Amino acid sequence: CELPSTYRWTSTGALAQPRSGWVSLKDFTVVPYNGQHLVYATTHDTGTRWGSMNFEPFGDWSQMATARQNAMNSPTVAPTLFYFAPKDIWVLAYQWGGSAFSYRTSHDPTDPNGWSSEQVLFSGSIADSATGPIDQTLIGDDTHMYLFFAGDNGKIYRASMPIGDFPGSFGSTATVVMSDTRNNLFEAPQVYKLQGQNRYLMIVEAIGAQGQRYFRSFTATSLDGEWTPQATSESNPFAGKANSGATWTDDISHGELIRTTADQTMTVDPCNLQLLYQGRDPGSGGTYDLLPYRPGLLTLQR
- Residues contributing to the annotated binding site: 190, 254
Q: Bridge-partner residues for 274, per DSSP?
A: 299
CA distance 256 to 78: 11
Angle, vertex CA 16, rays to CA 12 and CA 22, nearest 5:
140
CA distance 174 to 177: 9
Q: Return the closest-CA partner of residue 284 out of 296, 294, 276, 295.
A: 294
DSSP state of 244: S
Q: Return the closest-CA partner of residue 197 out of 267, 281, 137, 277.
A: 267
Q: Give the length of the chain.
A: 302
List residues forming the annotated binding site for Ca(2+): 190, 254
Q: Return the closest-CA partner of residue 121 out of 174, 75, 72, 74.
A: 174
CA distance 119 to 172: 14
CA distance 11 to 62: 13
Question: Around Cβ 192, how many Cβ atoms within 10 Å?
Answer: 23
Runs of H (alpha helix) within the chain: none
CA distance 283 to 171: 43
DSSP state of 163: G
Which H, E and C letters describe 2-23, residue by residue? CCCCCCCEEECCCCCCCCCCEE
DSSP state of 68: P
